[PDB]
């Protein structure tokens, strides 16, 4: 019996009931839930004693439906993972850091907007399928080259920081701006809405204004422009850094190379910021909402 | 015969196995002929002689084609599903029918054709040897055992395990999960107190990782969630050291060939890295030396635990991401967990335990050797729990175990929300904890009002809510309202709530009485 140092409410004046008890509610099957226990421990053995007394022979088949009602089992779904491997991605070509790391692992549909769980699942699936020991035995000497491709993708996309770096550098998942006159034949606002959300990933504030249609109010227009004009981004270019020969050990050579790559990184960041500013300017130039607002 | 059974507890993992028995209702782990209580699940053959344990682990250099290891997963698994990654050094399984097989030389004659033993044959031989060593230690012939298994073994794998045991002349009374064995190893101790706790079992092994979330109420446990990761583990921890020391050695010795490409060199580096890892897991400084790595070149260096955790930092956040992934999958909050038991050989690392100490609030108890004085061996938890279960069920008839392990006994509709009473001062107090199992009766003692007299006990439903972080209760639908007449000033009122299988709710509020029924 648990002792609790908390006071009970004083009974209101003029309240009574049969045997000083009033039934208001009850428990429902929605208010409950069926889970299955693990048959372990002396208190379970006592429970099993009681159940054997109540029912004797257990109706496992009858209660299978009850157990199936609210239980979780492993979900095996390789249907999406099957995808397709046309021409075996250059016939198991192997070249570090200069290839496509989403096709090997079937990530074209999701790309950046992916889940670590599916990444792990796909990695396991294609390790089972293209394992050198398991399947190259039937003469597939170059299958290990593919396995190397899965392995390289696994390390590069395994850690959050480096995978984010690779995405930032070369996602290869962007829409070019619709500057073409031929492209500019549909609704202007829809044609521009997609680009802002496509590149909005790098913002500091997760909730991001998203342009809009003709009816968009003046306050929304101002908020959207102010947010995009003052924008902070985490896009980075370290992944493009020059590699170093292993023979080198001189502190001086390492320091020199580090300075060189750092300056190149700063240059790339600056040019990217300028490009984004140019796109925002072109959007403001095209927009006519400001003209309508001045007219009001 | 049931009255003459000799039962033991067995833990059977990918990396190593363990055996245990019960002395005076207390579990004790058995040491084998080599003195090992964590016996590697490795088999090796030399000159037709069968070797196991530490000798088999050492004989990897001696026999390339006669060593078998990492065969636990392959059991009861089809050729397509089996993964030979960890088994790459060991014999390649050859798809015969639906049952892959290892081809090794187990005969004594030097010009004899090597046998093609099945995975079942290998499991049978290994369990036979384990039972035999238990028999020498006990002085009696072991006849029965309870063996621990992960929760994701398929029915076909269970059948393979029982068939292997039958071929090894061992009848398996029951298969239990390693988290359940680990929790029982603590709960069945004399000093243990049964109470409602949220328990996280983190079994961190060599080739695998298991995180399981359980709610333990009334001394009985209900599984809320489970995750199993094959990526982060002791093999990866050994690998970061093999690469680190390969870089150091190569730099120190100019022109040396990288040891990672030579199978003998890489095996020596793994064994020495594992020994150095355990030495730095027991001490703050560890030595690393290998005589004649390649071309007769020796190597000797040192490494501290700080450098080990620095080069191994990434796996620590991988384990963190795993634990929050599991809690989110269980729909819970770190403020909701009461105890986290850290299990497995890797669980002896102090820094991982400290990492969970920083992840979880101080009210949560982290049961790990370096964070609790009363902790048990994480590599012995499962084997001792299995031995305790074997001693508990050694007298039951096989029909009694069969009926006791059916869904008709285990299944029940757990009450979703909480049941409590409203307290006011001039807040929801839970009496029935959430996710109730079978019939539950709980008791609370509350304070009377400032002067007392007539007092209102209003029992309502309750739900947990997180406020930004601190957990509060939110009062929902009202269940019952009772009154106690003339309560003394400062007296305590005893309130009992019973939720019978029939879903009938009995309420009692007697001061130290009023009773009521909710159909
Ligand atoms: N005393 C120890 N100190 C530190 N690490 C250890 C110790 N003993 C074993 N280990 C390491 O911990 C891991 C063993 O953990 P665990 O006991 O959970 O494995 P297992 O039961 O053999 O296998 P499985 O993970 O398949 O259940 C291995 O990586 C091993 O090298
Ligand atoms: Mg284990």
mmCIF file of C-alpha atoms and ligand atoms in Angstrom, chain B residues 11-16 72 148 178 203-206 208-210 343-345 378-379 382, ligand 2:
data_model
loop_
_atom_site.group_PDB
_atom_site.id
_atom_site.type_symbol
_atom_site.label_atom_id
_atom_site.label_comp_id
_atom_site.label_asym_id
_atom_site.label_seq_id
_atom_site.Cartn_x
_atom_site.Cartn_y
_atom_site.Cartn_z
ATOM 1 C CA UNK B 11 22.782 -18.142 -23.216
ATOM 2 C CA UNK B 12 23.561 -18.707 -26.896
ATOM 3 C CA UNK B 13 24.746 -15.622 -28.760
ATOM 4 C CA UNK B 14 26.575 -14.962 -31.992
ATOM 5 C CA UNK B 15 29.868 -14.064 -30.279
ATOM 6 C CA UNK B 16 29.963 -16.274 -27.171
ATOM 7 C CA UNK B 72 24.236 -18.770 -34.542
ATOM 8 C CA UNK B 148 17.792 -17.667 -24.228
ATOM 9 C CA UNK B 178 17.462 -12.270 -23.246
ATOM 10 C CA UNK B 203 22.129 -5.724 -24.799
ATOM 11 C CA UNK B 204 25.257 -4.555 -26.631
ATOM 12 C CA UNK B 205 27.180 -7.539 -27.970
ATOM 13 C CA UNK B 206 29.936 -8.171 -30.469
ATOM 14 C CA UNK B 208 24.586 -7.311 -32.608
ATOM 15 C CA UNK B 209 22.738 -4.685 -30.577
ATOM 16 C CA UNK B 210 19.317 -5.039 -28.944
ATOM 17 C CA UNK B 343 23.816 -5.782 -20.637
ATOM 18 C CA UNK B 344 26.376 -7.676 -22.688
ATOM 19 C CA UNK B 345 30.153 -7.733 -22.649
ATOM 20 C CA UNK B 378 26.097 -7.927 -18.014
ATOM 21 C CA UNK B 379 27.496 -11.050 -19.695
ATOM 22 C CA UNK B 382 21.006 -13.791 -19.400
HETATM 23 MG MG1 LIG C 2 24.257 -10.859 -25.981
#
